[PDB]
Amino acid sequence: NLTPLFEELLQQCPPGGQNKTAHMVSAYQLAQGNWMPTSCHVFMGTISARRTKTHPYEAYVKLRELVEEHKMKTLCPSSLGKHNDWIIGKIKYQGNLRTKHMLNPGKVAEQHNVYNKTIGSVMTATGIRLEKLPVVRAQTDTTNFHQAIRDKIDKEENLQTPGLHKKLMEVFNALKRPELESSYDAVEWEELERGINRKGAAGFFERKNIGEILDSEKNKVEEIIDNLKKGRNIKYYETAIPKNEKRDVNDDWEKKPRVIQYPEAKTRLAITKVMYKWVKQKPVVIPGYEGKTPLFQIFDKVKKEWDQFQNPVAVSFDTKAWDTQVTTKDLELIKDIQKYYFKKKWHKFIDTLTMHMTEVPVICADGEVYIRKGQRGSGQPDTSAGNSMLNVLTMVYAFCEATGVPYKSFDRVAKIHVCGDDGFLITERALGEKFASKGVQILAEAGKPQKITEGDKMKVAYQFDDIEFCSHTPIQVRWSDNTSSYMPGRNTTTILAKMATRLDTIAYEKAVAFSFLLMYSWNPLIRRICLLVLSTELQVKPGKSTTYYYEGDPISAYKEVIGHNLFDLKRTSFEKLAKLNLSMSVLGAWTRHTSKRLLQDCVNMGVKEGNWLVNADRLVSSKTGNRYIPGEGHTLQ
């Protein structure tokens, strides 16, 4: 009966190893009674117990007792490493973070959401009620910023199963790429400068952004590389800022933590110049890594896998606050894998870098300092590559331990896909259901707790378009050549909000409209707003600040990456569209007039003489009698 109470308690339990010297009992056995727990250290959901005359509820209080006594004896222990001493010398005032689990040695000296006016007014012309759209890209004040630190970052490292990382290395060995062993070398400045945002933010003590350092202090970046190569400490620190702050800028081309934590600009450059081939995944060596896959391609790619199983399911990876769950032992596991691929001349570089990373001085925007114990910093060059690999290994381990499949046999029964901590695997229904039910506890013990579903089971998708990945979900479309394909779907209310606002001109907006058209042409509402915005001021070229932009004609650019003409899209999946439109009605962001007013405005523009983008919309052109004849055009990043 009280099996669920025990299963709840068993994920508070400290992870332990296998105990052959005693009886290991599960939550079922404890609930049955006549089992007396001798230790709260959990191993694969089992506890050491003693046969006795014990009623169930009494056994629960013993375990709960144990779990609390152990928690009392390990909640507030640490020395500062010598290489981090320098930060103490910059402290000027006493600290007020009030951290409980990490040192707040003090404070060093000190050092908006607006509308896209064209996109926004097209929406309003339609009767879309902007003030009813969800809030996106919200900023946070210093007070809630420091609370987020206290809430998420201020913690002890997760305890993990003894010998866990040995086993995760055994998984790695089952998927390494031996032809690449000990081959990675640094890259040239020219190759680095090709894929780099020159606006990459400066760190707390820095003044110049990435571009300015490139142009004028390349020797400072090389002094850092030289120090690390030789095993010598650098002054490593990360800067904390709240999400959507001015320095919340991406180095490379929503899921971010509330607390961005990033290395200096000179330092991000030192790491990338040496560790390029791994942090950029050139080539891809992490199985199922979708970091380079365009969002308009991913679900088509995944469906071909889905179609080869007999009764496929997909099991979602959903780790609570992943970056705060990364342990020193996790980072060293990634260090060891990096050393596998890199030439030996860079091993001491990787050792020293990783060492700096296990205890990181972090400086808040306002100057407060905390010493972070392990964990991942949002802004590190190795976030995507390091988190993806750690996610893959951990999930393959967990699936294999839950199902009994051997690590070397994973590739035979499942497909995995990851984008950092985000991912899922496809496998046969029986395997997937076993993993979903037993994964929660195994991954708790591995130090990667899940956001657990009703019933404490992992989320399982029994039909393809129930998969969740990168905040999107498959939705099918029907083309006029009698084929079907899949596009990245997402709630209309969310798409509208994202398209309608930015953080602090026409050329930008048309870059956005194009970008959104590439992802959301399955959504008639979004598609028609896009075409109206692209119809604005045809003489101004699109900006290049966003995900994509077009050279020449946007409609032809679309056809180049999507594989059909916009005008060939004849149907969007009726059921799924209804799901993704639901919130529009719940929130009252549209009315009964909104689709017809938007279509009418498109028709009014397209009936007139000339060559109008809006006539690339199959239904708009059907009502106007005119088509769009498109020029040349190409999509660019």
Numbering used by the authors: 13 to 89, 91 to 124, 132 to 273, 281 to 531, 538 to 670
What does the paper say about this structure?
Compared to the RdRPs of other Flaviviridae representatives such as the NS5 of the Japanese encephalitis virus (JEV) and dengue virus (DENV) in the Flavivirus genus and the NS5B of the hepatitis C virus (HCV) of the Hepacivirus genus, the pestivirus NS5B contains a unique ∼90-residue N-terminal domain (NTD) that does not have notable sequence homology to any other viral or host proteins. The global conformation of our CSFV NS5B structures is consistent with the recently reported CSFV structure with an RMSD value of 0.9 Å (95% coverage) between the reported structure and our representative C-682 structure. These structures together reveal that the NTD adopts a globular α/β fold with an α-β-α-β-β-α pattern. The NTD interacts with the palm of the RdRP core intra-molecularly with a mixture of hydrophobic and hydrogen bonding interactions. Collectively, these biochemical data indicated that the RNA synthesis fidelity of CSFV NS5B is fine-tuned by its NTD through the intra-molecular interactions with the RdRP palm.
To better understand the nature of the NTD–RdRP intra-molecular interface interactions and whether they regulate the RdRP fidelity, we designed point mutations at the Y471 and E472 sites in the context of the WT NS5B and the N- and C-terminal deletion mutants. Among these five structures, three of them (Y471A and two forms of C-672_Y471A) maintain the WT conformation with the NTD–RdRP intra-molecular interface maintained. The NTD–RdRP intra-molecular interactions are fully disrupted, and the NTD is rather involved in a non-intensive three-way interaction involving two symmetry-related neighboring NS5B molecules in the crystal lattice. These structural data together suggest that the selection of Y471-E472 mutation sites is valid in perturbing the NTD–RdRP interface, but the interface may not necessarily be fully disrupted by some of the mutations. 60-min and 180-min were chosen as representative time points for a comparison also including single-point alanine mutants (Y471A, E472A, and the N-91 form mutants). Consistent with the observation in the time course experiments, every mutant either lacking the NTD or bearing mutation(s) at residues Y471 and E472 showed much higher level of misincorporation than the WT did. The effect of E472A mutation was highly consistent with AA mutation (compare lanes 4/8/14/18 to 5/9/15/19), while the effect of Y471A mutation was slightly smaller than that of the E472A and AA mutations (compare lanes 3/7/13/17 to 4/8/14/18 and 5/9/15/19). Although NTD–RdRP disengagement, a situation mimicked by the crystallographic open conformation state in a crystal lattice or the N-91 construct in solution, results in fidelity reduction, engaged NTD–RdRP with perturbation from point mutations can achieve similar level of fidelity reduction.
